[PDB]
Symmetry: C3
C-alpha cells in the first residue's frame, strides 16, 4: 500500500482519499464493490473547473449543485425556480401565471374575469362592450343591448329599459 | 455511457433528479410540469383544458361555431348556416343563404 | 509504478485510478493529452456528500444526476418532468396545460 489507509483492497478498490481533520470527513472514495462503483466525493465543495480558464462552472457547495451551463436530456425536478425559461413543448398539469403573451391559445374551457380586445371588452360584471366606427359602441349585458353613437348618445336599447 | 459530461463549461446529463433547482436561463425542448408559478410568459401555441384568468387581452377569438375578430366583430354561427354578425355599430342576422334578415344598429 | 495507481506518457498524463472490481470499471481517469483533459469518473454512483452531515445531495446514480439543490445559470434540457416550477420569465413555443390560473393573459 503506497496510499493512506485506503490503498486498494480486493473487494472494494477503495481509492479513498479520506481526509479526516477536526472530525470533518472529506474524501474521494472511489469505492468499487464490483456491483456499485461509488465515486464518493465527500466535500463541503465539489468543483469541476474547466481545464482552460479556471472557471468553476460546476460547483456543488452546501448541498447545492451550481452550474454555469448544463445540457440535461431528461430531468425530474421536485421544485424549480427559473428566472428565464425558453421551452419548445410543455405539458403543464396545473399553472398560476401573473402575465402571459400567447400567439395562438387553444383552450377547452376559459374561465375569465375580464376580457379586452383592441376594440372590445367583456367586463368581470358581464358587460360585453364592442367599439364601432366613428366611436360608436355596442354595450350589452344580461339585461340589455345598448347601441351608443360616436357622441355617447344611446341610439337603440333592447332589453330592460 | 457518459451520462454526466461536464465539457466546455456545460454539465451535460442524460438523466437528472433535482429536488430543488434555481435556474437563471432554461432552454427546454420538452417540459412536463405538475404545478407551475410563472410571473411572465410568452407562448407561441397553447392547448389549455381549463384556463382561468383574471384579465384576458385577446386579439382574435375563435370557437367551433363563433369568432370575435381583432376588429371587434363578434360572429356566431347558427343552425342551417345562419350567422349573427355583431360589432359596435350593429347586429346583423344572416340566414343559411347569406341573406341579411335583421339589422339592429347603424344601417 | 504506483500500486493504489498512475501513468505520465509524453503525450497523455493519465491520472487513471481504474478501480476495476467485478468488471465494473470504476475509475477516475483524469486524462490530459495536452489538448483535452478529461476527468472521467466511471461509477454506478458519483456521490458528492457534504463533509459535514454525510448527506449525499449530489448522487449521480444509474445514469441519473440526483441533486437535493442546484443553481444552474444556463440549462438546455431535452425533457423536463417538474413537480413544482416557479418561473419569472418564460418563452414557450408549444404548451398543453390541464389547469391554468393567469392574472393577465394577452393572446393574439
Amino acid at each position: 500500500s503506497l496510499s493512506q489507509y485506503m490503498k486498494l483492497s480486493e473487494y472494494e478498490a477503495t481509492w479513498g482519499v479520506n481526509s479526516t481533520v477536526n472530525g470533518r470527513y472529506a474524501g474521494v472514495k472511489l469505492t468499487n464493490n464490483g456491483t456499485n462503483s461509488q465515486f464518493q466525493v465527500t466535500a463541503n465543495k465539489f468543483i469541476v473547473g474547466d481545464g482552460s480558464s479556471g472557471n468553476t462552472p460546476f460547483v456543488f457547495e452546501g448541498g447545492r449543485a451550481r452550474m454555469e451551463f448544463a445540457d440535461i436530456k431528461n430531468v425530474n425536478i421536485t421544485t424549480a425556480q427559473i428566472a428565464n425559461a425558453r421551452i419548445q413543448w410543455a405539458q403543464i398539469d396545473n399553472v398560476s401565471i401573473s402575465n402571459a403573451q400567447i400567439q395562438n391559445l387553444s383552450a377547452d374551457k376559459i374561465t375569465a374575469g375580464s376580457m379586452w380586445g383592441s376594440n372590445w371588452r367583456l367586463t368581470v360584471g358581464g358587460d360585453f362592450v364592442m367599439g364601432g366606427t366613428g366611436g360608436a359602441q355596442l354595450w350589452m349585458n344580461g339585461n340589455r343591448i345598448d347601441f351608443y353613437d360616436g357622441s355617447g348618445a344611446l341610439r337603440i336599447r333592447i332589453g330592460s329599459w
